[PDB]
Amino acid sequence: MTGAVCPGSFDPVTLGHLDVFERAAAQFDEVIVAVLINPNKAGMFTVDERIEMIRESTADLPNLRVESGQGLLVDFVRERGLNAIVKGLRTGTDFEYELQMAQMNKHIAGVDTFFVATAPAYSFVSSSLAKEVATYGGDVSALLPASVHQRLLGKLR
Amino acid sequence: MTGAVCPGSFDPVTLGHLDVFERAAAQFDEVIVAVLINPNKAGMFTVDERIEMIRESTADLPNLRVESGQGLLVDFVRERGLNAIVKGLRTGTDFEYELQMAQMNKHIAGVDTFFVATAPAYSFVSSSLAKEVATYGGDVSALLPASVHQRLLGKLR
Amino acid sequence: MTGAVCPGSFDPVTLGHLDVFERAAAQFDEVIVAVLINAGMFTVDERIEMIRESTADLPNLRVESGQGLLVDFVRERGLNAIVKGLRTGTDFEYELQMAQMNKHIAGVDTFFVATAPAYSFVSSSLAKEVATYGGDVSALLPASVHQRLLGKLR
Amino acid sequence: MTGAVCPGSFDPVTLGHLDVFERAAAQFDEVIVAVLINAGMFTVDERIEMIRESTADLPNLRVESGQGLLVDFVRERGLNAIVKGLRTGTDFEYELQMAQMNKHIAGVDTFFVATAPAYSFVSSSLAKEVATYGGDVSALLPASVHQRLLGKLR
Amino acid sequence: MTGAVCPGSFDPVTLGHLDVFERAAAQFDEVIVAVLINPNKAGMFTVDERIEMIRESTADLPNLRVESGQGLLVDFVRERGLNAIVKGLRTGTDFEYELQMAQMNKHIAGVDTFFVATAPAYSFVSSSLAKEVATYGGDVSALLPASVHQRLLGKLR
Amino acid sequence: MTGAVCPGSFDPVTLGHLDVFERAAAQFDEVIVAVLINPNKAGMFTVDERIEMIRESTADLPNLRVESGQGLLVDFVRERGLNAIVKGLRTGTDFEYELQMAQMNKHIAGVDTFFVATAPAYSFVSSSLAKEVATYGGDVSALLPASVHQRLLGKLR
Ligand SMILES: Nc1ccccc1-n1ncc(C(=O)O)c1C(F)(F)F
Ligand SMILES: Nc1ccccc1-n1ncc(C(=O)O)c1C(F)(F)F
Ligand SMILES: Nc1ccccc1-n1ncc(C(=O)O)c1C(F)(F)F
Numbered sequence: 001m002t003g004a005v006c007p008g009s010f011d012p013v014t015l016g017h018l019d020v021f022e023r024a025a026a027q028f029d030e031v032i033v034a035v036l037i038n039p040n041k042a043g044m045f046t047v048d049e050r051i052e053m054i055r056e057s058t059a060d061l062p063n064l065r066v067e068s069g070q071g072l073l074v075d076f077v078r079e080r081g082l083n084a085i086v087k088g089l090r091t092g093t094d095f096e097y098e099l100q101m102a103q104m105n106k107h108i109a110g111v112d113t114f115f116v117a118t119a120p121a122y123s124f125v126s127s128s129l130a131k132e133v134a135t136y137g138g139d140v141s142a143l144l145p146a147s148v149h150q151r152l153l154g155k156l157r
Numbered sequence: 158m159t160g161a162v163c164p165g166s167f168d169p170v171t172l173g174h175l176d177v178f179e180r181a182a183a184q185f186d187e188v189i190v191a192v193l194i195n196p197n198k199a200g201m202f203t204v205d206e207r208i209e210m211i212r213e214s215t216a217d218l219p220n221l222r223v224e225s226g227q228g229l230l231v232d233f234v235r236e237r238g239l240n241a242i243v244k245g246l247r248t249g250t251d252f253e254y255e256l257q258m259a260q261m262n263k264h265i266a267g268v269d270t271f272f273v274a275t276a277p278a279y280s281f282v283s284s285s286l287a288k289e290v291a292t293y294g295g296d297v298s299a300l301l302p303a304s305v306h307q308r309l310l311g312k313l314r
Numbered sequence: 315m316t317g318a319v320c321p322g323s324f325d326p327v328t329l330g331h332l333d334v335f336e337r338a339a340a341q342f343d344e345v346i347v348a349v350l351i352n353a354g355m356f357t358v359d360e361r362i363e364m365i366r367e368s369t370a371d372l373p374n375l376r377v378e379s380g381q382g383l384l385v386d387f388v389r390e391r392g393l394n395a396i397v398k399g400l401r402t403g404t405d406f407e408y409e410l411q412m413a414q415m416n417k418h419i420a421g422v423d424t425f426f427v428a429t430a431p432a433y434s435f436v437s438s439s440l441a442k443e444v445a446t447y448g449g450d451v452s453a454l455l456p457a458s459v460h461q462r463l464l465g466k467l468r
Numbered sequence: 469m470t471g472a473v474c475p476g477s478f479d480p481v482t483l484g485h486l487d488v489f490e491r492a493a494a495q496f497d498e499v500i501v502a503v504l505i506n507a508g509m510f511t512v513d514e515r516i517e518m519i520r521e522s523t524a525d526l527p528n529l530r531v532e533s534g535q536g537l538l539v540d541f542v543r544e545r546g547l548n549a550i551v552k553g554l555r556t557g558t559d560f561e562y563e564l565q566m567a568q569m570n571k572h573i574a575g576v577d578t579f580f581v582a583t584a585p586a587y588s589f590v591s592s593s594l595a596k597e598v599a600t601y602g603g604d605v606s607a608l609l610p611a612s613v614h615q616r617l618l619g620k621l622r
Numbered sequence: 623m624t625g626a627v628c629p630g631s632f633d634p635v636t637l638g639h640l641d642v643f644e645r646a647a648a649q650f651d652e653v654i655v656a657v658l659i660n661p662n663k664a665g666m667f668t669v670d671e672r673i674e675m676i677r678e679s680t681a682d683l684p685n686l687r688v689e690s691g692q693g694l695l696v697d698f699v700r701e702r703g704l705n706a707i708v709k710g711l712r713t714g715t716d717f718e719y720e721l722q723m724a725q726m727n728k729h730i731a732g733v734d735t736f737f738v739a740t741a742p743a744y745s746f747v748s749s750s751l752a753k754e755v756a757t758y759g760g761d762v763s764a765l766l767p768a769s770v771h772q773r774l775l776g777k778l779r
Numbered sequence: 780m781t782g783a784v785c786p787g788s789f790d791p792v793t794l795g796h797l798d799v800f801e802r803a804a805a806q807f808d809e810v811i812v813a814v815l816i817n818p819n820k821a822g823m824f825t826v827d828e829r830i831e832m833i834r835e836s837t838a839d840l841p842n843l844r845v846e847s848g849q850g851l852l853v854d855f856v857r858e859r860g861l862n863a864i865v866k867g868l869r870t871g872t873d874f875e876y877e878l879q880m881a882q883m884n885k886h887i888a889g890v891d892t893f894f895v896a897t898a899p900a901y902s903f904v905s906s907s908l909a910k911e912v913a914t915y916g917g918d919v920s921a922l923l924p925a926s927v928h929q930r931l932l933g934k935l936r
């Protein structure tokens with residue numbers, strides 16, 4: 001059985017992330033989405049809220065599961081019998097930064113990273129920019145899953 | 158039942174390519190190396206020679222096979238009942254160019270592309286630069302598998 | 315009386331190009347599309363025709379063929395601005411060199427716009443290549459252009 | 469009636485910025501410099517003042533402070549174009565994301581211009597940093613700004 | 623009488639840095655490693671510790687010396703009667719950022735900057751990423767000189 | 780004695796090249812400008828014309844000499860008792876390409892490469908773009924040494 005981990009803060013999950021999840025679940029026997037908890041930045045949504053939002057949006061992916069993770073990612077991956085990470089990239093400068101992390105993760109733990117190019121429609125979407133825009137009344141409903149948008153309006157109120 | 162195609166001209170295969178093959182073979186049930194031939198431009202090596210050099214250096218990968226082709230890569234992929242391409246990247250400029258072809262390939266045929274970061278040792282190795290340096294007498298033995306180096310020197314002489 | 319020139323080979327014009335034309339047309343009183351003679355699929359007249367067909371709804375745009383220095387083309391028509399679309403940061407680096415050169419020699423400025431997201435991967439070159447091998451590029455090209463491209467391949 | 473907004477923190481405005489203002493002013497009937505309140509050296513009023521002082525020769529330019537979404541600022545003034553300067557391909561990538569977002573949510577377009585070559589290395593941040601340690605940045609800043617910067621450091 | 627300054631925070635020095643030091647020392651009559659301290663931000667290591675770690679791994683470079691400083695790098699350079707800075711680069715984004723500082727430094731003080739490309743093996747090594755990975759238990763022994771690794775582990779414990 | 784080689788086609792030498800030559804001659808005891816002859820592309824100026832133009836523009840650099848070179852650059856460098864190359868860069872994408880060549884040259888012959896950032900005024904100038912512009916009556920006199928411009932007008936007639 002093949003498998004990969006899709007890591008991120010997902011605060012909140014976007015349609016870009018979801019596209020990556022779907023494409024991973026289509027090519028690996030199992031996919032684990034790792035929602036990374038950071039004690040430093042606490043973000044807009046709690047880890048449990050983030051997990052629930054992802055589960056709602058991935059309800060039709062039976063071979064994908066969602067968990068919280070903390071600390072060194074390659075430990076999270078290897079603890080679950082896997083040794084691949086799958087991540088989306090939206091630009092060359094994204095690649096450069098992620099490349100050093102991928103080479104580091106391969107060096108320290110033998111864990112591989114597979115990158116997928118963003119769907120063209122979501123090349124400009126990020127969690128941070130979506131939150132920023134929404135905070136000032138901008139409409140980001142076309143960039144987020146249905147599950148997220150309603151919950152986002154709520155947090156803003 | 159998972160699988161991916163690793164495409165290239167492989168004229169000749171490099172250690173960088175072999176690294177990608179090994180990493181693909183580790184993460185997918187089957188891997189097909191697609192030796193893509195330009196029927197209008199002979200390279201340095203014939204199709205038979207390219208395939209032999211790849212086979213000799215992949216003998217320890219039981220789930221990898223090598224086949225040639227031409228025309229649209231996505232047709233090669235789909236006619237084998239697969240839907241994924243695996244390719245290596247070295248730079249951010251690599252990524253921009255490949256992103257465009259990856260997005261085109263997904264658009265016209267639904268085929269996805271997964272990129273892996275080059276092993277650091279091979280980030281400067283290319284088929285073209287290896288051929289160029291060897292043409293002028295530089296030592297490229299450490300960048301090419303054994304199956305390649307002296308065949309290359311033979312071509313040049 | 316504002317104006318800009320949108321240059322390119324446009325062989326053929328894509329929906330990515332048309333997007334840039336419309337955006338230029340929305341912000342400048344006068345837009346001239348400059349079809350540059352440089353070697354490819356469509357003749358200059360054919361390219362001009364495909365563009366005119368696809369830009370009928372833009373009253374302040376016209377299409378002309380051009381040769382020689384782009385800056386001469388621009389200045390001989392009383393303008394001093396170029397409008398061009400970009401997809402990547404590598405696009406910017408290459409175009410930046412030409413933009414600074416053009417400003418240096420003739421005082422002609424260049425305004426760049428970011429590609430629409432949907433057309434990130436579309437280029438004349440790649441569309442021709444894919445169509446040549448039977449790939450469907452109908453969603454990447456103006457309706458008129460697409461039929462004409464089929465015709466060339468036959 | 470064409471127009472564009474040139475946004476930034478301008479803390480302080482540099483000769484690189486002023487170059488972009490002049491170039492925008494040359495191609496659009498109306499330019500509004502938007503001084504964004506976000507945390508730094510000069511107050512909003514001070515930044516506005518330094519810009520007005522340095523743009524007296526541009527009759528079709530005015531300077532206003534802004535808060536909230538840039539697209540709201542732009543649309544509430546009847547415009548739908550942003551003009552911004554770029555130095556590198558990395559600049560383009562970051563700005564491209566915001567430009568496509570801004571177009572998506574409000575239909576506001578963005579036009580980028582390449583920096584003048586002489587100002588490739590100038591930024592408000594680096595000029596302040598260097599001046600703070602006694603480096604001479606007088607050739608990188610408008611005459612007025614430079615005196616005012618000295619004053620802040622004293 | 624030729625000479626160059628190799629600047630950095632070196633918190634801690636990496637094998638990538640050491641490679642740059644060695645290459646500078648090979649091409650200039652004297653090299654000064656400038657340990658630049660932010661008087662307002664303690665790093666992980668004190669100035670004395672940073673200098674010791676660099677000295678212990680450069681003992682075989684007779685024409686290299688190590689000194690700390692703060693403020694404008696160009697003043698450090700000129701007060702030693704020198705006019706050149708030598709720095710390593712890994713990426714094109716590295717280059718854009720350093721180009722801006724190099725052009726500023728030439729403008730204000732006439733000091734030139736020479737960049738060298740990272741050794742391929744170290745292209746993913748940074749002081750910050752090494753500290754981050756070690757903080758969470760990853761093995762970074764092969765990216766840091768002997769003079770550094772266990773001191774780092776000691777800091778973390 | 781320290782030294783470096785400054786390689787290029789220099790067809791014709793530009794003020795950007797000259798800035799690099801001056802900065803190299805200021806930091807190394809000797810500099811050799813290697814005018815690379817290519818049998819494929821024959822260019823606008825003969826090798827001897829290119830050498831003469833460079834000598835005129837570098838008349839006040841007594842520690843810089845100009846020679847023609849052919850074949851593998853690292854052989855040219857090592858044959859002259861040197862093991863450094865100095866080259867200018869005008870952008871990050873220039874760096875990426877040159878980086879692979881620098882890593883290759885270091886690998887095959889132990890020859891180092893030092894890069895210098897372009898003077899801001901010449902960031903847009905190249906031999907090719909200068910020739911192209913001049914061919915159609917554009918004025919590139921501010922971008923080329925005095926020696927070149929007159930000779931360029933002549934070739935165009
Ligand atoms: N936008 C996007 C599209 C495809 C794949 C990934 C992304 N992506 N990458 C990082 C992030 C983030 O904001 O955290 C995202 C996005 F949020 F999903 F858009
Ligand atoms: N060098 C390299 C390393 C990892 C994956 C791929 C490669 N790669 N990439 C492009 C090319 C090329 O020849 O064009 C190669 C290489 F050839 F395998 F080395
Ligand atoms: N990694 C590296 C390799 C060669 C030259 C320099 C470095 N380098 N570059 C930046 C940095 C950094 O720590 O920020 C380093 C490293 F730290 F030495 F590794």
Ligand SMILES: Nc1ccccc1-n1ncc(C(=O)O)c1C(F)(F)F
Pocket residue numbers: 787789792793794795796797798799866867868869896897898901902903904905906907
């Ligand atoms: N333009 C420039 C500026 C500083 C250093 C180098 C250059 N450079 N680099 C390559 C080339 C070339 O055209 O062959 C040049 C230039 F031609 F000098 F501008």
